[PDB]
Structure 1
Amino acid sequence: MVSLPRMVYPQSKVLTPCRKDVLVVTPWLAPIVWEGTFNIDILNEQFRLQNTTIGLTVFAIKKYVAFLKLFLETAEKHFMVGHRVHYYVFTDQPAAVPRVTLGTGRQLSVLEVCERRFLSEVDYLVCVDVDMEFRDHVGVEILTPLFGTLHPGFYGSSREAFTYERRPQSQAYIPKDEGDFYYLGGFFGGSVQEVQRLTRACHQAMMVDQANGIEAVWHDESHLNKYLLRHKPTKVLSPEYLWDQQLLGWPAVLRKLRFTAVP
């Protein structure tokens, strides 16, 4: 709750949009995070004064443990640098986790495969896929009670084309005339409380489907989209936050490619 210190930065013009090529705010007034929309110095101050701790979770089972080295190494260079970070690696191969050198204020926990511990160790949880690498800044601008990320392959598509689950028998069902955006199952997060609510809701929904003998078209991602349709995220991250350059190139609307798939 402490006041920010004196800071010097250019004034923002009220009669000048920051981006004229993209939507920077949703209909429910949640910002859509694109490069140019935020002053990272102001945001860093706000979150540091709060002594914010960010938890980053990844699952690495079977062959996916081979992606951990690059993932963690690049995270050390681009993820929440300057803030307290706690990595949680869930794996079936504890002894296979690479020994990565971490900067100060950052720690790593290996969990072999207790929601209460999250509430006690971190303020925010970020959940992502491990077969990726950070290529640019991914900082506190993403922190909020609940956020989803615009899928790189559908940010420009009409909702009818969104690959939501379309069968009424599934708990993840979303009709052709509903839907705001198509979010990624591989990059979401928010406060520990909101994240656990989302995962708990999706777990229950998937069990109901299982009992009914049906599996959503895109599994977890399908349910996450249904959850975020009914519980609007407080921030939405642009595709800058999860991209595949090999498959999608580098469009003009993307000033930075922050987190990407590994070729």
Structure 2
Amino acid sequence: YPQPKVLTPSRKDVLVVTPWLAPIVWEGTFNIDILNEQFRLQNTTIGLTVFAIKKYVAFLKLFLETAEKHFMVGHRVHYYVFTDQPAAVPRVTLGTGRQLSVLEVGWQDVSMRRMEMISDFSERRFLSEVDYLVCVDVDMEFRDHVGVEILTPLFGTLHPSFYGSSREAFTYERRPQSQAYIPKDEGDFYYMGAFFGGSVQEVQRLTRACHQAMMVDQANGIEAVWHDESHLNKYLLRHKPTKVLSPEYLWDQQLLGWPAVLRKLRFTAVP
């Protein structure tokens, strides 16, 4: 491998470590050959959850085809597709060591569905073999490597509309009557609900907390401004992630182009 050089920053343009010493994952910050060896030595298994409800089942074919090209290639992967149309999941051929299961799903209860269902699912014993869970939205495609550099006990992803913004511009929940409330003077980053994950335990804990917090808000007649994302951000403020993914990992090229600071566009919105 090329020797790291102590007197040469890996990036001169971006913050690559948070103030609580969690890596912010950008191209140029990691040697994937080292990371792949470390994770393969542990026989790492990654579960990928994705919800595809009503017309959004149409997005599963490109999402899965492109996951097979770019997501955790060479590691053990299990896809868990949550859908109300289990018979409509496309038959995509998978590489060795990779499996897919379909979990059938049965307005505020639809708002709670994602955290409720990931919470119930994440506690099942059929996950005993799975080491990390990654939770993403379906109306996306992979365009470049998304691999074991993201894995850690708890991660969030910088929202691509906000990574350049000050915190008062962040769209946190600002009513103190909501469990998701964040005061004006608080907050590290604005994380997006479309891509988070961690170890199975840390994802049990995040989704239980978000689900329980939303049920309290429902009981009180309150819907947070950005729904489970608002709760995700209150959670990650109090329980800080151990890696943060850069917007390479969650981007919309039609809306935001391809700025110089993004050396790769890895996981993008489908236009």
Q: State the TM-score bracket (shorter-chain normalisation).
A: over 0.9
SS of 1:107's equivalent in the other structure is strand
CA distance in structure 2 between the aligned counterparts of 1:43 and 1:155, rounded to whole angstroms? 26
Q: Deviations over 1:25-59 (max 9, x none)?
A: 00100000000000000000000011000000001
Q: Deviation of residue 10 (structure 1)?
A: 1.0
CA drift at 1:119: 3.7
Question: Aligned partners of 1:167 and 1:259: how far apart in 2?
Answer: 33
Question: Deviations 1:79-125 (Å, cap 9, x if unpaired)?
Answer: 00000000000111111000001000000001111x22354131000
Aligned residue for 1:190, secondary structure, equals: strand
Match of 1:51 among 43, 46, 57: 43
Q: Contact conserved, 1:119 with 1:193, CA < 8 A, in 2?
A: no
Name the TM-score, length of structure 1 as normaliser.
0.96
Q: Contact 1:118–1:192 at 8 Å: present in 2 too? A: no
Q: Is the contact between residue 183 and residue 224 of structure 1 (CA under 8 Å) also seen in structure 2?
A: yes
CA shift in 2, pair 1:33/1:118, >3 Å = farther
Which residue of the partner structure matches residue 73 of structure 2? 81
Mapped partners of 1:118, 1:17: distance in 2: 43
Provide, for residues 117-136 of structure 1, a one-character-per-residue CA deviation record: whole Å limited to 9, x for no partner: 35413100000000100000
**Runs of 4+ in structure 1 over 6 Å off:** none
CA distance in 2, matches of 1:216, 1:25: 30
SS of 2:190's equivalent in the other structure is: coil
C-alpha displacement of 1:253: 0.5
The alignment partner of 2:34 has SS state of helix
Question: Are the structure 2 counterparts of residues 239 and 118 from structure 1 closer, same or farther at C-alpha, using a change threshold of 3 Å?
Answer: farther
Q: Which runs of 5+ in 2 are unaligned?
A: 106-122
CA offset at residue 178 of structure 1? 0.1
Of residues 118, 123, 126, the one that matches 1:118 is 126
Partner of 2:195: 187
* 2: CA distance, partners of 1:159 / 1:71: 32
Contact residue 62 and residue 93 of structure 1 kept, 8 A: yes
Mapped partners of 2:126, 2:40: distance in 1: 19
CA distance in 1, matches of 2:194, 2:234: 15
Aligned counterpart, 1:153: 161
- CA distance in structure 2 between the partners assigned to 1:180 and 1:225 by the alignment: 9
Q: 1:68 to 1:102 in 2, by over 3 A?
A: same
Counterparts of 1:13 and 1:255, CA distance in 2: 21
Aligned length: 254
Query: Which residue is equivalent to 1:256?
Result: 264
Per-residue CA deviations over 1:136-194 (Å, capped at 9, x if unaligned) read 00000000000000000000000000000011110000011000000010100000000
Q: Which deviations, in whole Å up to 9, do the C-alpha atoms of 1:199-253 show, x marking residues without a partner?
A: 0000000010011101000001000000000000000000000000000011110
Check 1:28–1:118 CA distance in 2 against 1; reply closer, same or farther (3 A cut).
farther
- Please give the alpha-carbon distance, in whole angstroms, between the structure 1 residues aligned to 2:230 and 2:63: 25
CA gap of 1:164–1:118, structure 2 versus 1, over 3 A, is farther
For 2:46 and 2:192, how far apart are their aligned partners in 1? 20
* SS of equivalent residue, structure 1 residue 121: coil
